[PDB]
Amino acid sequence: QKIELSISLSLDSPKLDESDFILLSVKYLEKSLGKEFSGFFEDIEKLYFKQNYKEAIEKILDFCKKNESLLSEQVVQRLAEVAPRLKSNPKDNESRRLYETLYADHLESVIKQESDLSVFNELRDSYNAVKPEYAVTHETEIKTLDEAKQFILSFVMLNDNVELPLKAQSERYPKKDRSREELGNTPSANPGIMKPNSPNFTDNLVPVRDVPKIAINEKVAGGYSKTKPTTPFVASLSGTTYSLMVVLTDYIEKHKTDKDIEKKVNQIINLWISSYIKEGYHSYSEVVDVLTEPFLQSIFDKANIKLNYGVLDDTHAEFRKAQDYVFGLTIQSAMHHELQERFKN
């Protein structure tokens, strides 16, 4: 019980949230347990990813109870007695921001492995026909996946016209928490969706780019910063996902018969999900929860296609390095608090 002082001085930190808790609780356990416990950890991953934070916390709090023989005794005094107070500010929730920008490079990772960019070279037909006013197609073929991102990110130019019909029928896009206060671009180096002036590892940093500044209207009627306090996000509720479904719907219906339609639809959805949390446009929830809308599932579920929603199995790499971030930030505060409770002396 030596290196556990740290996981308790991280709880003296006033800004611990739900995400920080799990990402530390799990490491405290793992680094103290070692066995039969790999259905806890693999599942806490699935639970953290789904942003079902307290479904997970109930597991931790009980595990801590069932395995208190194994557990250090007074950690749960502080692991608990902290759990009831946990909230998530979706402004300041960048433990999950790190996670998802890592999870975005690993979703890309798996997509490059499936090299068959056939769909993007044949979604180049739904585009042209579904959205008439834009430069047609890609002007050429999709040879790489970085020019596939380009296509997928041209489905933004299909906007305010062809998807307005689909944005109605949504019981949630009316509930956007965004603003028109119009704050404008600031410099950043922190990658993806994370904040410009928030810590990052020297190895995740991407080059300096000017990224936007978007705020939250906190006088909205439960429109996702409160509905989902957990999701960390920049500009709420997508907006162009309803425009993906304009291209995708006619595609899926023309190419419904093709046998690898799933093999080619999850690719479109998962390139999108990833190239938005990787380019900073959105957060997973901002792209998925739009598609978890029943009306959208309709054409999918009537083409006998499902959606993985960018879910993956080995996110231990992504869980990890998020644990070390929380640690770096939590005891960060400590040195800072002890630095300043020594300056005041």
């Binding site: 290196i3 180096a189 410009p196 020297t202 190895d203 005891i331 630095l339 300056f343």
Partner: protein
């Protein structure tokens, strides 16, 4: 056991221990290897003379100056300066005491990994941390948020820090510093009819600068007070029996910082460089930086520097802004004092990277441990 802290910076290396309110040893960052067999001929199992004695004998022993711009460059000659740090000077063993290190602002991910390696692979350190000079020059002044102007012998930088994090999108580097001044002062004194050679008689000129030089609030008023009055003149007795006179060359020397055009450069001075670094940030944090500007370093140790950094940043900035310039008298060693502090803190026991996590993860742990 106690900690060891080192500031590999620019020209001179500040080393010592934690808790110490002062660096025990401050020697150069020079390594002097041999010129030709014939100096190796001789005596010794020793190849190079590193540090304080390299400069003593250097016409015989030709030298290298590593890390003169804050970034290390020679990683073989830097294993040496860390030997004259925890071995042949500041004597106790590396293996026994835990080390805190200071990287330059914007240190490459790769130059970092070597310090982690060289420390564990070559020095068997129990534990290690690599921090930024400027993050620690603000912790001295008791801050965790603000902007630092770190000036050493060869590199000057403006580093904004928002909660322990220097913001890389806004770190700005000037690359004009202590030597550039002594050398200007050498040349502007070499013209006054008081010439100095450019090979070691120029240390006398490095003494007129720190000692008898100041930043002038209105250079232009200061120039007028010099050509009407001998009230601004001061006198220097040379170690060689000659007493001299200085005057205008005194305040012309630390002006290279504010106005860099003196050295032929087309860069921008510290006041401009500070404004530009504050505005490469978001408007929400700019207020806490204008009011929290720490002049750290030893080139930032000329009397009057913070009174010109008030006038020059009050003029450059919005009118609603409070500009507080904090130049503690121990700016010469604030990267130090604050490294001594970080390392003497009791919450720090965790961030020191352990040799157990070194072997398990590699030197690619500095990135995921140091911030």
């Amino acid at each position: 056991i106690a900690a060891l802290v080192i500031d590999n910076g620019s020209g001179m290396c500040k080393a010592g221990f934690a808790g110490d309110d002062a660096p025990r040893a401050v020697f150069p960052s020079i390594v002097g290897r041999p010129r030709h067999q014939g100096v190796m001929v001789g005596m010794g199992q020793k190849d190079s003379y590193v540090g304080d004695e390299a400069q003593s004998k250097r016409g015989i022993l030709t030298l290298k100056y590593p890390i003169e711009h804050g970034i290390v460059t020679n990683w073989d000659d830097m294993e040496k300066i860390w030997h004259h740090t925890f071995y042949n000077e500041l004597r106790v063993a590396p293996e026994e005491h835990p080390v805190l290190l200071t990287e330059a602002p914007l240190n490459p991910k790769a130059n970092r990994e070597k310090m982690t390696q060289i420390m564990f692979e070559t020095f068997n350190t129990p534990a290690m941390y690599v921090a930024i000079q400027a993050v620690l020059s603000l912790y001295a002044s008791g801050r965790t948020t603000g902007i630092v102007m770190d000036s050493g012998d060869g590199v000057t930088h403006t580093v904004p820090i928002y909660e322990g994090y220097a913001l890389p999108h806004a770190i700005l580097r000037l690359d004009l510093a202590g030597r550039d001044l002594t050398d200007y002062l050498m040349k502007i004194l070499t013209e006054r009819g008081y010439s100095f050679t450019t090979t070691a008689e120029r240390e006398i000129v490095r003494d007129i600068k720190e000692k008898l030089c100041y930043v002038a609030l209105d250079f232009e008023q200061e120039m007028a007070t010099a050509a009407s009055s001998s009230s601004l003149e001061k006198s220097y007795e040379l170690p060689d029996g000659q007493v001299i006179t200085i005057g205008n060359e005194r305040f012309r020397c630390p002006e290279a910082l504010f106005q860099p055009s003196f050295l032929g450069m087309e860069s921008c001075g510290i006041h401009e460089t500070t404004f530009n670094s504050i505005m490469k940030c978001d408007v929400d944090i700019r207020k806490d930086l204008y009011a929290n500007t720490v002049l750290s370093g030893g080139t930032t140790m000329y009397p009057g520097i913070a009174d010109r950094m008030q006038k020059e940043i009050t003029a450059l900035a919005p009118s609603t802004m409070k500009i507080k310039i904090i130049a503690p008298p121990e700016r010469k060693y604030s990267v130090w004092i604050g490294g001594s502090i970080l390392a003497s803190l009791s919450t720090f026991q965790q961030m020191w990277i352990s040799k157990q996590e070194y072997d398990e993860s590699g030197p690619s742990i500095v990135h995921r441990k140091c911030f």
